[PDB]
A paper describes a structure:
SidE family of effectors ([name], SdeB, SdeC and SidE) employ phosphoribosyl ubiquitination to target multiple host Rab GTPases and innate immune factors. Upon activation by host [name] ([name]), [name] executes an ATP-dependent glutamylation to modify the catalytic residue Glu860 in the mono-ADP-ribosyl transferase (mART) domain of [name]. [name] is a unique glutamylase that adopts a kinase-like fold but contains two nucleotide-binding pockets. Our structures reveal that both phosphodiesterase (PDE) and mART domains of [name] make extensive contacts with [name].
Here, we trapped the pre-glutamylation reaction intermediate of the [name]/[name]-[name] complex for structural studies by introducing a single point mutation in [name]. Our data indicates that the [name] E565A-[name]-[name] heterotrimeric complex is likely a reaction intermediate that occurs after ATP hydrolysis but before glutamylation by [name]. The purified [name] E565A/[name]-[name] complex was analyzed by single-particle cryo-EM, yielding a density map with a nominal resolution of 2.9 Å. The refined structure contains one molecule each of [name], [name], and [name] with the adenylylated E860 of [name] pointing directly into the migrated pocket of [name]. Intriguingly, the N-lobe of [name] KD and the canonical pocket of [name], which is implicated in the catalysis, do not make any contact with [name]. Accordingly, the canonical pocket of [name] also does not contain any bound nucleotide. Glutamylation target residue E860 of [name] is clearly seen adenylylated and inserted into the migrated pocket of [name]. This indicates that the trapped [name]/[name]-[name] complex represents a state of catalysis after the adenylylation of [name] and before the glutamylation. A key hydrogen-bonding network involving Q851 of [name], the backbone carbonyl of E860 of [name], and Y732, N733 of [name] positions the glutamylation target residue [name] E860 in the migrated pocket of [name]. A Mg2+ ion and the side chain of [name] R500 engage in tight coordination with the α-phosphate of the AMP, likely increasing the reactivity of the acyl-AMP intermediate towards the amino group of the incoming glutamate.
Numbering used by the authors:
A (entry chain C): 100 to 848
B (entry chain A): 231 to 506, 510 to 590, 758 to 853, 858 to 904
C (entry chain B): 3 to 94, 97 to 129, 138 to 146
The structure:
């Protein structure tokens, strides 16, 4: 009964029917070339192995900090456990042997720590780097020190983009496992390298290096999907007797009419500039979601559509005359003696926005839960909403900017040389008429099929031209071959994955701006600072729970565990503080000294927000002088834990999916051995099962129970095999399995 | 390099020492009353978190001024071998700062009793050793070379002897703790002079003046009472060496010994006893004797002792403000305050060395790919010009800084055209990855720059010939993708009308 | 009875993990794997029973409500004294090991308990005795 009409899969590429990758400048047509990721990565790993060989044969091994030698050794052991060829594996182990000897001699405590990491995991470098040791690029340091022969241009570009950490050079399974375990409870990793001058943030480079390793997604909609199945036209077998004796109000271009059954009949008249196709599309989508509500398990109250037809503008302008905004309405609707109206019957809460301040925090929590759940359940079904709200960046050059002014929640991924999230222009007028309601979702007409993200659609060609046409910058231009080489042009093959993650991030950004608008409107009527702080604290809780529900719906991770993984990465306290500070005009009263002293507190361990523009009093940051912006002009957004929360959410979703891919790729390799299809020694089978153990979700136990069962079957195939290297980790798995099956027994009674 | 303010290791050690020792109420019934600033309780108000963080900053600043003094050709001290505080490495300084986080962790009151002294010092040693035993993982591989290393530092914490003048770690950890207790002792003219003559033995006059100027600015930053030096005070002079007095013998002349080869040597030290004339010697007459005037600058020079501005009305309620308790109970906040203070103390000697002075951006980066020999010949000049501008405390220095700046023609590569800069350091690294980055600071809009429209964050700057660029600090920020050192110079724009 | 919530969360995570295209339906080719991952490793005939019973039209796909009903009908008389004995024997060995190691492992392994919960269960207790005294 309950299932989705869309299904995921892998495709060859998304680079079909795109704008040809050329940059036209001064009559020159500069071709744009891709720098292959998983080939330059391998070239650099081989240069690293050569550098390790030079380091060993140079006897300068004592002149390396003993934690970097431990890092080199653990990386070599992990890398040799990831290789499948015997010759390369044995070369890597012959490299790792002298380092192990030197560490056992010089630093016996570091050696005792290494030897306990190794009897625990097959990739012991991921557990060694779950802390601020990740910010040390030991691989690149060794490459720079001993490989004096110059790197090529592709390797130089790879070094430039991924200069921060050394995990950006791990092969796919090791990097996916490290990324997923960075979010573990026992991890202190934070993608922030606070140095003496700059305080580099690279939380986006994590998702950038994760996505360049993925395979292009493709969503196939079923035959009975809304955007595949066709239904007959709409028959005007029903007309609504519009009577000003029952008109409640005029909301935008919708006339609300009271009902004896306490519902509200909305008559949505055609806007100026839209065809009958839009109104009939909304009719069809409403009927679809009413038909398939129990299947999708949607929480919203849905607008039951009654009809769609044409009425004389005389009747509209005579019913609408007795109101307040009757003139404004008269300018919105189209100019014609007959107007297309769509008539539905919605509950009253459908016309209350989500940021409405007449709802207590309990009702706001329930409504935000409903809206987030339905948004992501419909994203799983193949339906996206590119216009939940009109969030904009820099209205100034709107029409001539590559993004058309529209706000990109993941701007660092979808552009070359863009490092922070930019200013939100009039962040409150952007959600003024949001499509999130106290009952659920609304305005289901300006939806889209998810397949518009993976193809060169009009939405994609309109807003994401930079991503789809390749990246250019005067420094990419290889003056010899006359083409601009870039790691960013490769994203042409994969641009659908970036747009998927950007859709998730922008859903969450709209939820955040809606909650911030609610808080800003509801705390203006209060002077009791404790209650205002309690409001903003509960709103931060709502935001983090909404991101955890997004993660749960997309990946399946339980919501509590996803919340814990999130709270490892983004600080909820600094989020509540920064939202309270910047989403209210109260910082406009403070002078310079008090402003800096309060930023010291809200940022708490990282640089402050530096802005040079004058604050309009009573307003805040503003370029027009009457509506508040989130950020200065030509500068970033001051909500930094929001950006970290968005990137943590999308990185968790995509990394969980990729780690499940690695897990099943290794599980089928394991099962091909326990059936005789690949006859190898006992060490090969045990290494396979142990690698399978190293690829399970952090704190997910049924995966480890599965791997343990495979290990038992492997022992039943190789009876007399020596298991002195793997008995420990699977003993721990058996112990925690016994603990779980005990807790569930006692907890029941 | 290494900085106390952005380390997350000394910060973790300080957070530990606070959550376990420095944030716990006193139990000694001797000045154990926890104060209440604003609404927040401050238990250890004299040897708390603020004190330890200021001592760490003192160690950092002392080694910085020593390095700076070595460049201009000074004659420093000797630690039993060819070495001085100018030769302390960043790892040794990190070890010293980790030690200084627990130096007063094991106290229970402000009793100066010798038995209490040794008890508190050995309890501090025990707390330090317990922290090291707890976090041995990331301490012995990198921070502490061996276990004999941790034992040496725990033995300099316990301070069983008084061999402060033995090794650089001893001198740092002990001066930083003694020079801080100079705003509480009542007679400033004696304690300040004692600490001044005890520190200038190691570094020098011009650098000790800087240490104490930046100390006063640290006090202002962390909301502490700032004493006022005055070379015409009539309070009886107390010798901080021990606790004695100076009495003049029967006409006006202090009682002095009769040693070999000279009847004019060390003043005779007298404990507090009877008089009659046998009257004591006040700090005024003590600071103008021939054997102390020619070695102490403050002889005949005064200080205001407070904020240049706000009077005692709001000064008291800013000292007793709520942000003082927050500075006493948050490592992040106190570190931010000390960091801002040190940055302004690094910049302001330039502004005061010269005469009085869309939106323009403050910080503008400009990459450059230069040679290596030329880069060395550039770093030499930049450091030689940085090591001539110390934060003077008593004597306003000279126009010599102005003449050295104008004679040093390093500023020609920094301008004289329409330079193409940016406000992102990542853009300089991820596009050109230059090896010589010039970071120009525009504190008050003196740098006429215009946006050119990622070339939206890029700017075009033109340096007016009435404005000069003076180097604040050379740096080293890793290696570029071509495998070469990347030096991040730092300049500041100053209105220099005399540079026509 | 019915299955709890910490069991439903695990069932939903497993069903979501082994649904490789994310359409909310798992094939019969990995129903055996999703049941082995849950500590239910049945014979080929035991799985064929549900292959025939559940799939009565040949669709070859299970929905999560159907999977839950199947997994609850399977867990009717599968957990018993044998299961509890194996659970206690993995820790032990004559029948009593320690009460300290128990309190340690019941707060660090799996869905960790609390002091009050563990102590109460410890007070409710001799492995076999405590397992047959409930
Ligand atoms: Ca499926
Ligand atoms: Mg702009």
């Amino acid at each position: 009964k309950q299932y989705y009409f869309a299904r995921r899969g892998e495709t060859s590429t998304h680079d079909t029917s795109l704008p040809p990758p050329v940059k036209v400048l001064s009559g020159r047509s500069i071709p744009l070339k891709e720098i292959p990721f998983e080939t330059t990565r391998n070239e650099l790993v081989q240069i690293y192995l050569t550098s390790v060989d030079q380091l060993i044969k140079s006897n300068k091994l004592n002149s390396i900090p003993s934690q970097q030698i431990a890092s080199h050794y653990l990386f070599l052991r992990s890398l040799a456990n990831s290789e499948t060829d015997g010759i390369k594996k044995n070369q890597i182990l012959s490299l790792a042997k002298p380092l192990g000897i030197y560490l056992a001699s010089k630093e016996p405590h570091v050696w005792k720590t290494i030897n306990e990491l190794i009897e625990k995991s097959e990739y012991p470098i991921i557990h060694y780097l779950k802390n601020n040791r990740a910010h040390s690029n030991f691989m690149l340091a060794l490459i720079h020190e001993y490989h004096k022969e110059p790197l090529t241009k592709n390797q130089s570009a790879f070094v430039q983009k991924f200069r921060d950490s050394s995990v950006f050079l791990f092969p796919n399974p090791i990097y996916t496992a490290w990324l997923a375990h960075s979010y573990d409870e026992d991890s202190s990793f934070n993608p922030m390298f606070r140095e003496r001058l700059s305080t580099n943030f690279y939380h986006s480079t994590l998702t950038d290096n994760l996505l360049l390793r993925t395979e292009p997604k493709e969503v196939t909609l079923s035959s009975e999907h809304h955007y595949k199945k066709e239904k007959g036209p709409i028959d005007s077998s029903f007309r609504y007797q519009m009577s000003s004796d029952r008109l409640l109000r005029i909301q935008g271009r919708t006339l609300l009419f009271s009902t004896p059954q306490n519902d509200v009949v909305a008559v949505k008249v055609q806007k100026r500039g839209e065809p009958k196709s839009t109104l009939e599309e909304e009719f069809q989508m409403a009927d679809y979601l009413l038909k398939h509500q129990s299947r999708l398990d949607v929480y919203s109250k849905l607008p039951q559509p009654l009809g769609q037809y044409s009425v004389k503008k005389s009747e509209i302008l005579e019913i609408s005359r007795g109101s307040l905004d009757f003139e404004r309405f008269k300018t919105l609707i189209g100019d014609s003696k007959d107007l297309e109206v769509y008539v539905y019957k919605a509950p009253l809460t459908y016309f209350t926005y989500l940021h409405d301040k007449n709802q207590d925090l309990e009702d706001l929590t329930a409504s935000v839960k409903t809206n987030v759940h339905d948004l992501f359940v419909l994203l799983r079904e193949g339906i996206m909403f590119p216009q939940l709200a009109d969030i904009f960046h820099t209205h100034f050059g709107e029409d001539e900017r590559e993004d058309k002014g529209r706000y990109q929640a993941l701007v660092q991924l979808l552009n070359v040389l863009q490092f922070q999230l930019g200013r939100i222009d009039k962040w409150q007028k952007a959600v003024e008429y949001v499509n999130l309601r106290s009952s659920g979702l609304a305005d289901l007409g300006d939806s889209l099929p998810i397949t518009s993200l993976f193809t060169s659609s009009d939405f994609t060609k309109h807003y994401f031209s930079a991503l789809l046409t390749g990246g250019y910058h005067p420094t990419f231009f290889d003056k010899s071959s006359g083409t601009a080489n870039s790691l960013f042009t490769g994203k042409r093959r994969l641009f659908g994955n970036y747009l998927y993650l950007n859709t998730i991030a922008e859903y969450l950004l709209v939820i955040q701006l809606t909650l911030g608008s609610y808080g800003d409107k509801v705390t203006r009527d209060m002077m009791d600072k404790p209650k205002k702080e309690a409001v903003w604290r509960e709103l931060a809780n709502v935001m983090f729970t909404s991101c955890a529900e997004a993660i749960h719906i997309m990946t399946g991770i339980p919501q509590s565990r996803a919340l814990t993984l999130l709270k490892q990465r983004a600080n909820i306290e600094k989020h509540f503080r920064q939202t309270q500070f910047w989403m209210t005009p109260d910082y406009s009263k403070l002078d310079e000294d008090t402003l800096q002293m309060e930023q010291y507190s809200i940022y708490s361990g990282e640089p402050e927000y530096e802005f040079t523009d004058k604050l309009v009093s009573g307003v805040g940051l503003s370029v027009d002088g009457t509506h508040q912006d989130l950020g200065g002009y030509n500068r970033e957004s001051p909500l930094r834990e929001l950006e970290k929360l968005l990137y943590a959410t999308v990185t968790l979703i995509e990394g969980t999916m990729q780690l499940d891919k690695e897990f099943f790729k290794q599980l089928q390799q394991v099962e091909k051995i326990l059936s005789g299809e690949i006859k190898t020694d006992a060490n090969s089978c045990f290494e396979a099962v142990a690698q399978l153990l190293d690829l399970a979700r952090p704190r997910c136990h049924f995966q480890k129970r599965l791997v343990l069962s495979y290990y038992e079957e492997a022992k039943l195939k190789y009876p007399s095999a020596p298991t002195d290297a793997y008995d420990s980790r699977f003993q721990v798995v058996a112990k925690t399995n016994a603990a779980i099956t005990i807790q569930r027994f006692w907890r029941e009674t | 390099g290494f900085s106390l303010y952005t380390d997350d290791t000394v910060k973790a050690a300080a957070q530990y020492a606070y959550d376990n020792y420095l944030g716990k109420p006193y139990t000694g019934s001797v000045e154990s009353a926890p104060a209440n600033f604003g609404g927040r309780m401050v238990y250890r108000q004299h040897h708390g978190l603020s004190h330890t963080l200021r001592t760490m900053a003192y160690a950092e600043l002392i080694v910085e001024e020593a390095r700076k003094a070595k460049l201009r050709g000074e004659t420093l001290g000797k630690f039993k071998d060819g070495r001085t505080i100018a030769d302390v490495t960043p790892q040794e300084l990190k070890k010293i700062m980790i030690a200084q986080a627990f130096f007063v962790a094991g106290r229970d009151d402000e009793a100066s009793d010798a038995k209490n002294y040794q008890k508190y010092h050995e309890q501090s040693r025990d707390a330090f050793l317990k922290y090291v035993k707890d976090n041995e993982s990331t301490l012995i591989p990198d921070v502490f070379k061996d276990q004999e290393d941790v034992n040496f530092y725990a033995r300099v914490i316990e301070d069983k002897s008084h061999d402060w003048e033995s090794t650089p770690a001893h001198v740092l950890i002990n001066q930083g703790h003694m020079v801080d207790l100079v705003r509480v002792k009542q007679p400033p003219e004696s304690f300040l002079q004692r600490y001044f003559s005890s520190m200038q033995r190691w570094i020098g006059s011009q650098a000790t003046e800087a240490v104490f100027g930046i100390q006063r600015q640290f006090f202002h930053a962390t909301y502490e009472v700032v004493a006022g030096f005055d070379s015409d005070n009539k309070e009886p002079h107390l010798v901080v060496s021990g606790l004695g007095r100076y009495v003049i013998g029967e006409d006006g002349q202090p009682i002095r010994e009769a040693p070999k080869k000279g009847q004019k040597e060390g003043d005779l030290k007298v404990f507090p006893q009877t008089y009659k004339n046998e009257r004591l010697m006040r700090v005024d007459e003590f600071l103008k004797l021939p054997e102390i005037q020619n070695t102490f600058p403050g002889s005949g020079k005064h200080l205001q002792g407070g904020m240049p501005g706000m009077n005692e009305m709001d000064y008291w309620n800013r000292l007793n403000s709520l942000n003082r308790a927050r500075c006493e109970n948050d490592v992040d906040f106190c570190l931010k305050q000390l960091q801002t203070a040190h940055d302004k103390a690094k910049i302001e000697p330039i502004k005061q060395a010269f005469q009085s002075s869309a939106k323009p951006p403050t910080r503008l980066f400009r990459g450059l790919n230069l040679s290596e020999e030329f880069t060395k010949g550039l770093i030499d000049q930049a450091n030689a010009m940085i090591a001539n501008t110390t934060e003077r405390l008593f004597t306003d220095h000279s126009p010599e800084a102005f003449k050295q700046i104008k004679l040093n023609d390093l500023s020609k590569m920094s301008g004289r055209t329409n330079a193409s800069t940016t406000t992102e350091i990542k853009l300089v690294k991820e596009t050109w990855d230059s090896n010589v980055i010039f970071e120009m600071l525009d504190p008050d809009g003196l740098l006429h720059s215009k946006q050119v429209g990622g070339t939206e964050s890029e700017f075009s700057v033109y340096l007016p010939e009435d404005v000069a660029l003076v180097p604040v600090k050379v740096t080293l920020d890793g290696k570029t993708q071509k495998g070469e050192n990347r030096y991040v110079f730092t300049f500041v724009a100053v209105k220099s009308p005399d540079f026509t | 009875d019915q299955l709890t919530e910490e069991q439903i969360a695990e069932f939903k995570e497993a069903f979501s993990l082994f649904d490789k295209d994310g359409d909310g339906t798992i094939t019969t080719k990995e129903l055996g794997t999703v049941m082995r991952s849950l500590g239910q490793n049945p014979t080929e005939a035991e799985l064929q029973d549900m292959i025939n019973e559940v799939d009565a039209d040949g669709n070859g796909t299970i929905d999560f409500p159907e999977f839950l009903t199947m997994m609850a009908r399977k867990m009717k008389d599968t957990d018993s004294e044998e299961e509890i004995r194996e659970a206690f024997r993995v820790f032990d060995g004559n029948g009593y090991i320690s009460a300290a190691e128990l309190r340690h492992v019941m707060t660090n392994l799996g869905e960790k308990l609390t002091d009050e919960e563990v102590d109460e269960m410890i007070r409710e207790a001799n492995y076999e005795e405590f397992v047959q005294m409930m």
